[PDB]
Amino acid sequence: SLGFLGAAGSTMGAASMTLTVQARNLLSTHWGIKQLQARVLAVEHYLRDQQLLGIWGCSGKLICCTNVPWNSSWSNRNLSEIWDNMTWLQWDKEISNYTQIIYGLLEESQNQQEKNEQDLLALD
Amino acid sequence: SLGFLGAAGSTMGAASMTLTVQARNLLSTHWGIKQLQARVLAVEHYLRDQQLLGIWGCSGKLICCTNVPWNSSWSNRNLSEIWDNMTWLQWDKEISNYTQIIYGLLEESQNQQEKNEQDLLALD
Amino acid sequence: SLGFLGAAGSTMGAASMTLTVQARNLLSTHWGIKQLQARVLAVEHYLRDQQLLGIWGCSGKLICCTNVPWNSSWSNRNLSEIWDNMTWLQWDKEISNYTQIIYGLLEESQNQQEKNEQDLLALD
Amino acid sequence: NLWVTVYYGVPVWKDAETTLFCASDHNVWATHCCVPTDPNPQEIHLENVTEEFNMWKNNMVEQMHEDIISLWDQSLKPCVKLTPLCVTLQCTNVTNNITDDMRGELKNCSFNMTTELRDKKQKVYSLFYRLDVVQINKEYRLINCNTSAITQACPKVSFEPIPIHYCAPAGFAILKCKDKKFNGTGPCPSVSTVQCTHGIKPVVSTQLLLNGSLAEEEVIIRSENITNNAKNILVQLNTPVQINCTRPNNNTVKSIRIGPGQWFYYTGDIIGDIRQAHCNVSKATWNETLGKVVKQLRKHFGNNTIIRFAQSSGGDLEVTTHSFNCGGEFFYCNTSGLFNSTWISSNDSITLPCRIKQIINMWQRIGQAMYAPPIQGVIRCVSNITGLILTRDGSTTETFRPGGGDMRDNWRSELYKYKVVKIEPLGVAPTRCKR
Amino acid sequence: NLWVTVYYGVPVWKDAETTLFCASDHNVWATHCCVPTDPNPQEIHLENVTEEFNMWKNNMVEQMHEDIISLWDQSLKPCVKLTPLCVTLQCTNVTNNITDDMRGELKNCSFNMTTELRDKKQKVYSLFYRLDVVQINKEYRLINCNTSAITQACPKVSFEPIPIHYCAPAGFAILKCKDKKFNGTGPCPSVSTVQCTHGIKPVVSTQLLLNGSLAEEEVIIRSENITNNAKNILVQLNTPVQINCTRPNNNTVKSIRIGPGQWFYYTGDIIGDIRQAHCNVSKATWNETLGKVVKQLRKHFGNNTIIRFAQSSGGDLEVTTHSFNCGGEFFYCNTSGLFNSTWISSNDSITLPCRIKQIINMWQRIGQAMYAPPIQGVIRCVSNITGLILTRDGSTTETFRPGGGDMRDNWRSELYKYKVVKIEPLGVAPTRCKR
Amino acid sequence: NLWVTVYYGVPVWKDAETTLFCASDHNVWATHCCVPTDPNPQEIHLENVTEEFNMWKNNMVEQMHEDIISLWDQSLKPCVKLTPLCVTLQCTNVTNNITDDMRGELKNCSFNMTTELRDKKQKVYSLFYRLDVVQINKEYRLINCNTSAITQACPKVSFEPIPIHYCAPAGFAILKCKDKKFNGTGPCPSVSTVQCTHGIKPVVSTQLLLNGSLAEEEVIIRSENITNNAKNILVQLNTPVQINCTRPNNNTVKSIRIGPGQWFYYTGDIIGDIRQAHCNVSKATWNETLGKVVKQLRKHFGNNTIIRFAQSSGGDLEVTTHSFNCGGEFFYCNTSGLFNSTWISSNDSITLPCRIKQIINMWQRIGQAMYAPPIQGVIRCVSNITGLILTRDGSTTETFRPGGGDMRDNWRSELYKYKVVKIEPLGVAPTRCKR
């Protein structure tokens, strides 16, 4: 249908149906140094995003529902105003100051879950 | 315990029992560039295969069962021929024209499944 | 709060609450090679550990419970001697002789498990 | 009520700077070192996406500049050095077939050169173009002897530009501006995504831009700040102006060995009449073209003002004169015949006289000189003027003069449509599911 | 009914070209740059696997060629440049203790050489071998003064071959053919997998192959196309032929300074009588060896044909003679005494005369000459002939001659049994399992 | 009834050797090529962690040594070569204004050097410091003409130390020892983790260590094996001793083109009288400092023993004198005025005479000489003595002398508190959890 980033500008609800379009393009004699640096950098960025998904308990998923509630202080926009009337570029700008807060909450939540699972599995 | 490619030539139903033998041996003065390119390339190939398993919903598995039905137009053989007489090299040479069809279907199936899970969890 | 290896020296059960702390610190002319090699090496080590978790069925976890029983021949201590009265550096030395045995057992139990899952999913 | 949901593969990006690599389909651009291209390249139109572009802050320009210089220098590394040539020369005038245009332009110089054996010498004479030779006190020396060493360019390596495509690494993308009448700094309502730029020819010139892209609807005038005087004005033309350049002399090229495996090339003689190099521009086309430029300038300077064109005020030949490589020779053409008019609200050509130099200092550097060996025979080349670089003088009359000199402004005329962004696939949004 | 099941770690592979690295273990081969070897490697036999090998399309050969040349050149980068040696020489003949054969093969040349100080000169004389000196008009110059610079090889760096192991990168594997009597181009029913090749010694020779692997059952004859007379034939012997080579002259080596920390080495004099260099091949062994070779040639040429061996056809010494490095000296041996027989169905040697050169142009390149400093004392080396390179003339007699020159043909004799493949661990197959 | 549980992110480590990289913040250390530093680096204290350190087996020292040499060499690579300067010199003594401290230390030499044009020569007069010139038989030569080439250091590139921070790559960390009175080889009860070291200035000196770290409470004596004689003793002071060094001569520097864009710098003349370079150390501070050194030395040699200090016994200036770079000049100061006492259970300074050299052979290598161009005017520098390098002679009296020469002993005095460890985040332990 659309190529890489062809969904940009569409609403978030529409853009979410093309997630593999972008996921598949990640990772895809002095002048050999530029080529190696370019290749290594692509790998490092890929791995950092994957590491976070691992830490947050979203490894292997494109869509991951978690146990961290949404705070209206980050944004109080209605879901019909977010998913149908905004694109992802706009959304990213709207909440760009809260991503560190959210990320900290996501990793802490998963850490607590790791510990609760371990204890339940210790019962016979 | 036959060695790295020791099961090659055995039938598919036998060779499937050595998947860790092969998996564990993957990923393991201008000469500095020559050697470094060799190392970078090994990493890139490893990551691309892992990325596909991720996209298809097979992350972390050596054996993964999906929801894509097999089409007789890709290959029409009895399962006993495939698993008891053929080896994997022979199989690879017969199904080689369909791999880009099958991979596409595996991706579509997983993306639809994640959407369905996300919607179902809206009720949890 | 104890930002990196700050739990070293604390008991094993105390340090278990800081696993994300260390995980997040992995991956983050002539020299253009010296620096690049350092970056590539960091990636290679990261991936080797992730591959082992993968083949043990622990790909998305920080705390992974397995099906391999503990042998008193590796270590014959009580839980309160290991978890409350010892640190991780001490434990690592205590069983450094048996890590290869344990890893081999973990690889095998995962293979037995994946085959059993494949067979059960064929019954319907 | 709402929960955080993490999404991966989200189509967003950020302005970013990364290192780009080249793709390219014996050449001073070492194109054999570049990646083969995609025969069916993709371009993805982005509907409802408006981006901010700024051609004056575009780091692609800086990378092109650095790669061009590095490729240039690498091509000279294995070539014969001319250290043995920096000797006192004994020179007289070439007076044999002078049409009075060339009086004093060519000098006949003799010298003692080294040879294959270090205990022998040979007497050699050759012709020089004056601009390359300076007087010592009939004693002359090459102009570079008190500043820099000279490396002879390899005679087998072409200087002809080959289009170079700049490609982003995975995880990055290049956004292209598709709007017409785009001035280089505003928002661009219509954009598309590509992985590689189109090929750009690294044409080197100093006042007029040659063999670039044309504007499609009108002449477009771009500048960082049009009301300043400290900035150059880049004018992109709608139609090309054809220019015919020649070095109408039949050269006989001779060579000598100056050491073991070391050959030196020089002009031995000239057959027939000696004439000046020159370029032809049609008057009718030029007049219409310049009139179009004036019309567009009026949008910023007034419909009741006077627009005057004049010659560059002074400075080095590389700045005041229009320089280019034509068939391997380096020409310095006088453009005073193109910018000599006041605009107030046929087969008749313009001839621009040109000078030739063999000792060249490129990229405005000091200490690295190149010797361009002569080309045998007669040289003719035809090229397109696709743009201009003008400056404005610091009443009711504005005056514009040829500018240029600084190579980064040539590359800005091709790279203005592109920007590099980083893809940021991971992000969050509220929704109804939890787990 | 059936479902797609994805498997990872599938034991399959494809032909591929990748970069191999060296792992070998004061030498021209940078074995100190290479990776240390594994104490014992793991060779895995593959039961029921037949694979196709093609020794003539093997990219391992091209990499070996490039790596050897690059290492060779790197070893000369820090060595003395003999620029000041290219002078007019005053040469006379060495006549003091000359036997009839080696007469006119030594020159006694004097010249003016530089010293540590720019303002001083020294008179030096040395001995040269004629092959490396050419006449100018008594006045001589070194043979390469009109084409190249000469780099003196460093006297402390050995030219003795050290085995080098070629290793595949992770994700790749090297398949090896264990088929005895394997001709290099067909299916191989018995294969194994290794990570690294056996050590291969980079022995350089031109007509006879020295110190390689032997055939296990019989003489094996291989070529790209046995009926194409434009192709070379590689013959692998199953028995060595021992060859004893010597330079039976006692050289006194002198050294002078030629510049600020630079020194030149040369033969000063010869103690005792002057004798021709030579190689000894036993007649009986050589005649048995050819008998085996012709027996095998008849399989392709007929059981009623005539097989005739003859000398080389022409060209320079590098192809007309058998060249090799013996103790640091470079020998050019006449093999006409070996290839002189027609085949139709005790303590007695063959002496092959040899000449010595000091100025050497390797790898058939132009512009890069090496000066091999002389070795003090008397040289003797013993080596094994493990194979031959033969050509065939373009109607009852098939005439064969020594071939050579193209170094890739020597490597092909060790690498014929290896192929590089890419491991492709991911794939699919139908099963009755779904989810 | 316990099961194996796998934990990832476990806070453990192993001793390891990896490559560290440079971080920093027109200088021979090429700090522009280093990673900019973190303005707010962290240090994390590890409670209840005891580690073993061994400063004598610390591979960080070896890397610093290699990096410093490589940075040094690449900074001379692009500078003017002085090859044409190795000529016979005609020299007489400078006797115009001598305080007989300098009686015969300076010589006035004349020579014929090259010019921009090959056919012309220039006569040059210059002053040399004796230690740089040797007599040939009045006829002199530069001291290194029979051992090495000389490269002139670039006059625009500073030799002043800039702190360098060594940083571990991800997956590695550097542990620092916080214990006071730590002698470098025992267990360290108090440690902390850092990613980068503090900045270390690459000060190059012999015998006395300049501008290093001070001990917190008391003088600390460290050695690999205190009872050997084959090992040096490193003494860290807890107070600085101020040393004031100068060359009180108003030297006028001249510059001559020696080739096509090449230039040689030299001392033309000296304004005023000619005096000896020297360093001033206060006696009271030095005597208190030395007494502290003795007090802590008795701990290993007996509190009833005799401690005697003496001058170094022999070797070249690099080891017999205190070498340092002061304002770009290289000083060789005689320290026998400091190490002259026997210890048994206002504004009066010690003056150390110093010599100056221009032809330098650093890192104890042979074949690479540097010419340090002179610095115009009068030079003065003030620095802190923060430690000593002492040797011990092989009865009742222990005799100690200044040691030095091996640069790794200097860097080891700053890096003694750090070790590199590899993080091993994966491990197992028994729990009651099973799945």
Ligand SMILES: *[C@@H]1O[C@H](CO)[C@@H](O[C@@H]2O[C@H](CO)[C@@H](O)[C@H](O)[C@H]2NC(C)=O)[C@H](O)[C@H]1NC(C)=O
């Ligand atoms: C190579 O092929 C042979 C068959 O030609 C395999 O041998 C069979 O192994 C099975 C399982 O043990 C036995 O039930 C059969 O009776 C054997 N066949 C014969 C003719 O003996 C052999 O295992 C294969 N090798 C490898 C490594 O897979």
Ligand SMILES: *[C@@H]1O[C@H](CO)[C@@H](O[C@@H]2O[C@H](CO)[C@@H](O)[C@H](O)[C@H]2NC(C)=O)[C@H](O)[C@H]1NC(C)=O
């Ligand atoms: C199984 O494969 C066949 C062959 O590709 C599919 O049939 C084709 O379907 C397309 C429409 O998408 C038609 O244009 C072709 O003419 C059909 N070819 C034939 C031979 O019938 C079929 O749909 C696939 N079935 C399933 C369940 O995947």
Ligand SMILES: *[C@@H]1O[C@H](CO)[C@@H](O[C@@H]2O[C@H](CO)[C@@H](O)[C@H](O)[C@H]2NC(C)=O)[C@H](O)[C@H]1NC(C)=O
């Ligand atoms: C270092 O060791 C001390 C003990 O020597 C630890 O402090 C104890 O912590 C327990 C658990 O909170 C308390 O019940 C004790 O009363 C504490 N004892 C003392 C003397 O303070 C300390 O937490 C350890 N540090 C780290 C980082 O683990």
Ligand SMILES: *[C@@H]1O[C@H](CO)[C@@H](O[C@@H]2O[C@H](CO)[C@@H](O)[C@H](O)[C@H]2NC(C)=O)[C@H](O)[C@H]1NC(C)=O
């Ligand atoms: C685990 O083993 C340790 C060591 O044997 C136990 O510690 C001792 O346990 C015995 C009972 O078996 C007591 O009599 C000792 O007094 C304990 N030693 C001390 C002083 O700590 C430990 O108790 C065992 N498991 C537990 C804690 O139940």
Ligand SMILES: *[C@@H]1O[C@H](CO)[C@@H](O[C@@H]2O[C@H](CO)[C@@H](O)[C@H](O)[C@H]2NC(C)=O)[C@H](O)[C@H]1NC(C)=O
């Ligand atoms: C080339 O070399 C010749 C040498 O024959 C130079 O001729 C000499 O020139 C010098 C003056 O520079 C006279 O004093 C000699 O008498 C000349 N020698 C003869 C016999 O010709 C010639 O000058 C050199 N090249 C130039 C600069 O002309």
Ligand SMILES: *[C@@H]1O[C@H](CO)[C@@H](O[C@@H]2O[C@H](CO)[C@@H](O)[C@H](O)[C@H]2NC(C)=O)[C@H](O)[C@H]1NC(C)=O
């Ligand atoms: C564009 O250029 C104009 C000048 O043509 C700049 O305006 C001047 O700014 C300075 C500094 O504030 C004032 O002192 C002058 O009086 C201003 N001149 C005029 C005519 O207004 C303007 O700032 C520049 N804009 C940018 C973005 O660089």
Ligand SMILES: *[C@@H]1O[C@H](CO)[C@@H](O[C@@H]2O[C@H](CO)[C@@H](O)[C@H](O)[C@H]2NC(C)=O)[C@H](O)[C@H]1NC(C)=O
């Ligand atoms: C090496 O052995 C192979 C067989 O393993 C020979 O292959 C033949 O090649 C010709 C080419 O024209 C084909 O027509 C034959 O059918 C092939 N035979 C077989 C059995 O495959 C090859 O010619 C031999 N080469 C040499 C030099 O001996």
Ligand SMILES: *[C@@H]1O[C@H](CO)[C@@H](O[C@@H]2O[C@H](CO)[C@@H](O)[C@H](O)[C@H]2NC(C)=O)[C@H](O)[C@H]1NC(C)=O
């Ligand atoms: C090549 O040299 C070897 C010795 O290096 C010769 O072997 C010797 O032969 C004689 C005569 O039969 C024996 O007495 C010696 O004992 C042998 N030496 C050894 C070490 O075994 C060989 O004959 C020579 N071959 C040729 C063709 O000259």
Ligand SMILES: *[C@@H]1O[C@H](CO)[C@@H](O[C@@H]2O[C@H](CO)[C@@H](O)[C@H](O)[C@H]2NC(C)=O)[C@H](O)[C@H]1NC(C)=O
């Ligand atoms: C530095 O201090 C350590 C103590 O932490 C000393 O180590 C001891 O060495 C002596 C002599 O070998 C032994 O008798 C001790 O038993 C060692 N103790 C330990 C902890 O092993 C070390 O010798 C001191 N070094 C110096 C130069 O003072």
Ligand SMILES: *[C@@H]1O[C@H](CO)[C@@H](O)[C@H](O)[C@H]1NC(C)=O
């Ligand atoms: C652009 O907006 C229109 C509505 O004005 C919508 O129909 C169209 O689908 C949007 N484009 C994209 C890519 O979503």
Ligand SMILES: *[C@@H]1O[C@H](CO)[C@@H](O)[C@H](O)[C@H]1NC(C)=O
């Ligand atoms: C982030 O904070 C700045 C003030 O520092 C504010 O101007 C900006 O609008 C904020 N952005 C968001 C998404 O809240």
Ligand SMILES: *[C@@H]1O[C@H](CO)[C@@H](O)[C@H](O)[C@H]1NC(C)=O
């Ligand atoms: C030679 O050229 C100079 C200009 O460089 C001129 O002054 C002189 O008159 C000319 N001589 C002749 C004979 O034309």
Ligand SMILES: *[C@@H]1O[C@H](CO)[C@@H](O)[C@H](O)[C@H]1NC(C)=O
């Ligand atoms: C380009 O367009 C922008 C629109 O915001 C305007 O501000 C700027 O002055 C224009 N510049 C030129 C040279 O036309």
Ligand SMILES: *[C@@H]1O[C@H](CO)[C@@H](O)[C@H](O)[C@H]1NC(C)=O
């Ligand atoms: C022009 O040059 C030719 C040689 O190419 C010569 O014969 C002729 O005399 C010259 N013309 C004049 C006016 O001297």
Ligand SMILES: *[C@@H]1O[C@H](CO)[C@@H](O)[C@H](O)[C@H]1NC(C)=O
């Ligand atoms: C120059 O110095 C040397 C030093 O050994 C001395 O012997 C000589 O006499 C001095 N010459 C003069 C003129 O002072």
Ligand SMILES: *[C@@H]1O[C@H](CO)[C@@H](O)[C@H](O)[C@H]1NC(C)=O
């Ligand atoms: C320079 O060269 C001349 C050659 O005649 C020689 O006499 C003179 O002594 C040399 N000058 C020096 C300082 O050696």
